[PDB]
């Protein structure tokens, strides 16, 4: 009775929101983008092939100055590279061999790692002793940690497999804020440039927008058919691209609160692992389980290019803060730089 | 330039050399040690096996010292039953130790183990890694069959036509009926294994009991056979 009444109310509000969504769909993105000129083809070339990792590379991240990067391996090593000269700066041994995410703080001072060990670990790079030592370890989450990002040197956002997201303050070490709205594992999350908002995509074929200060879900974006493996903001912070296992990448915009473009090809059965944008927001890159990276031009959903230098699943793909290069790390223990 | 930056680059190369010299050593350490998964459907004596081979965090790691060969065994706990995402982290393990309770006739928990084993066998990124199958908790298997209170015909309609394999090696003091049912559960797992061609993947059934202690030796031989089978496939041959 009461459960059925609640279900009917949820259904009727869902119908109202669907009608509202359809009301604002005056014209699709295809019509407005038909006029602009296509970019043609982009021939991206490999410059540095970073070697020194034994097991698969599962996560990587760039610095603020687009010089130093971090890669994590399921071998239990966190290697901090300098892509310019292909030296390695810091081979951090990991307490747990299994790692699934790494992050660079936006000051060059701390790095963050996490994985199946259920504990996110912060390592300090500016130790007076000169030896890299673990600073803090946070163990609030129950499910395996999926990804982590830094707001500043003091606050860290973590997304784990317990269908919850958490915001921690490093000094006090306890969960400052919690986010419980998802019905499945929260696979990825991305942060707006203004850092006031962040959107997390989960395995419920849904993404959710959260505000860090207030700690409530603003809008929910649905429309995918499988688990969203990755998601990244637009450079302007007013749109986001989500890639799932249904072999289609979608583009959503916050203000219309609905999808806009449906990048897909009929010959693509393989899924998507990671997505990212360039500085201008024109070119977007998306990794694939079939060991290649397809680059879709701007908006017309035409394959601008293919990057097929890898042998196994590409797991991480990241564009530098100044847009000089794109770094792709795959499961063949090889991390490559393309431009 | 060379006036000011040359020393910085030289120091960076020295740091690279030190890091590489460390990487050689832990590379030897990593490649020398083998790794195994411990997977359990539920109530199949996984903790019993852990205690037998022994001689909050979500992953617990155990060490072996068998025949001067180092083994690491990883179990999964405090993680939700949705395992379609973190199972992909384990495509580099030597083998996945699948522990199944044979007393399963969830009313039919055995079918849950069979369906899960199908997912592991046919998974895209678990095709290379082999699975060691431990039919476990047979101590009461003979008891219920001898008692005859519960039937596997109701939960498995294809047992009645099934006959005892000719190439069977029953243990002494075992009833003929339990021996036939012992190999029926094995053949259900084997039917899944042999259905798929492309022999990069193989299954290793092994009956087990709580009283047994030599489960070290059965794992050691399986890891011996798995690694050499992979070497055979490289050199054409098998």
């Amino acid at each position: 009775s009461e459960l059925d009444q609640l279900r009917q109310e949820a259904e009727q509000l869902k119908n109202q929101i669907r009608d509202a969504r359809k009301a604002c769909a005056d014209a699709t993105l295809s019509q407005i983008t038909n006029n602009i000129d296509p970019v043609g083809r982009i021939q991206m070339r490999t410059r540095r092939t970073l070697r020194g990792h034994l097991a698969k590379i599962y996560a990587m991240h760039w610095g603020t100055d687009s010089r130093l990067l971090v890669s994590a391996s399921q071998d239990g090593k966190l290697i901090i590279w300098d892509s310019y000269t292909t030296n390695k700066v810091h081979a951090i041994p990991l307490r747990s061999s299994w790692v699934m995410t790494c992050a660079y703080a936006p000051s060059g001072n701390y790095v963050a790692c996490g994985g199946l060990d259920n504990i996110c670990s912060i390592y300090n790079l500016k130790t007076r002793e000169g030896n890299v030592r673990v600073s803090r370890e946070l163990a609030g989450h129950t499910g395996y940690l999926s990804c982590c990002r830094f707001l500043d040197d003091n606050q860290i956002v973590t997304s784990s497999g317990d269908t919850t997201c958490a915001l921690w303050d490093i000094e006090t070490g306890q969960q400052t804020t919690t986010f419980t709205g998802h019905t499945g594992d929260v696979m990825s999350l991305s942060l707006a440039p203004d850092t006031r908002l962040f959107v997390s995509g989960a395995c419920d074929a849904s993404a959710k927008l959260w505000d860090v200060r207030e700690g409530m879900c603003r809008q929910t974006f649905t429309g995918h058919e499988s688990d969203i493996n990755a998601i990244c903001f637009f450079p302007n912070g007013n749109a986001f691209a989500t890639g799932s296992d249904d072999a289609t990448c979608r583009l959503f915009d916050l203000r219309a609160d609905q999808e806009l473009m449906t990048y897909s090809h009929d010959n693509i059965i393989c899924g998507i692992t990671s997505v990212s944008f360039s500085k201008s927001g024109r070119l977007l890159l998306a990794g694939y389980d079939d060991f290649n990276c397809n680059v879709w031009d701007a908006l017309k959903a035409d394959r601008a290019g293919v990057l097929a230098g890898h042998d196994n699943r590409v797991s991480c793909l990241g564009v530098t803060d100044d847009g000089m290069a794109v770094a792709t790390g795959s499961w063949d223990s090889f991390l490559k730089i393309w431009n | 330039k060379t006036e000011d930056q040359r020393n910085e680059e030289k120091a960076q190369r020295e740091a690279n050399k030190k890091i590489e010299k460390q990487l050689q050593k832990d590379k030897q350490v990593y490649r020398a040690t083998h790794r195994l998964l411990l997977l359990g459907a539920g109530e199949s004596g996984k903790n019993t096996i852990v205690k037998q081979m022994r001689i909050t965090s979500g992953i617990f790691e155990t060490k072996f010292q068998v025949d001067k060969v180092n083994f690491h065994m990883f179990d999964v706990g405090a993680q939700r039953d949705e395992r379609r995402k973190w199972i992909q982290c384990f495509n580099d393990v030597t083998a996945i130790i699948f522990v199944v309770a044979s007393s399963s006739y969830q009313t039919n928990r055995l079918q849950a183990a069979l369906k899960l084993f199908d997912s592991i066998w046919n998974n895209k990124w678990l095709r290379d890694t082999s699975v060691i199958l431990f039919l476990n908790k047979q101590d009461l298997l003979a008891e219920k069959v001898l008692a005859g209170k519960s039937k596997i015909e109701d939960y498995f309609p294809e047992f009645a036509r099934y006959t005892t394999p000719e190439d069977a090696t029953p243990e002494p003091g075992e009833d003929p009926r339990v021996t036939r049912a012992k190999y029926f559960i094995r053949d259900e797992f084997l039917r899944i294994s042999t259905a798929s061609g492309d022999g990069r993947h193989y299954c290793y059934p092994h009956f087990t009991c709580a009283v047994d202690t030599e489960n070290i030796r059965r794992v050691f031989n399986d890891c011996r056979d798995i690694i050499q089978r992979m070497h055979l496939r490289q050199y054409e041959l098998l």
Partner: nanobody
Amino acid sequence: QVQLQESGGGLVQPGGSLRLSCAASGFTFSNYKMNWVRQAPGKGLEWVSDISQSGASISYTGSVKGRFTISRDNAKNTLYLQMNSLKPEDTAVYYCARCPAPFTRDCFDVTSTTYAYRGQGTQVTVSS
């Protein structure tokens, strides 16, 4: 939005035939693999039947073997489960589930307590 609606099922006499319908939307019915799972009272989810992408490989659990027929209408995007000669132990809450990824032989996490791609669930009761 990916939603699945289950129709049919109720208090029925034993030995009868019941048809359960799963209507799907928001995704390509052709690409994915359909499963039927049932929830007994006081017990967890147990898998019952499955139908593959094209409709060739069909498998059932032991209890429902020989009495259950699973079919799919790709044009109508409708998954039919036909039940014949029902038994008192067959009462449960049924669920039309979809495996997470398309074009994949494996089909993970269909009996978990919290699964996103599972319907609200129809109720089937068998009693005198």
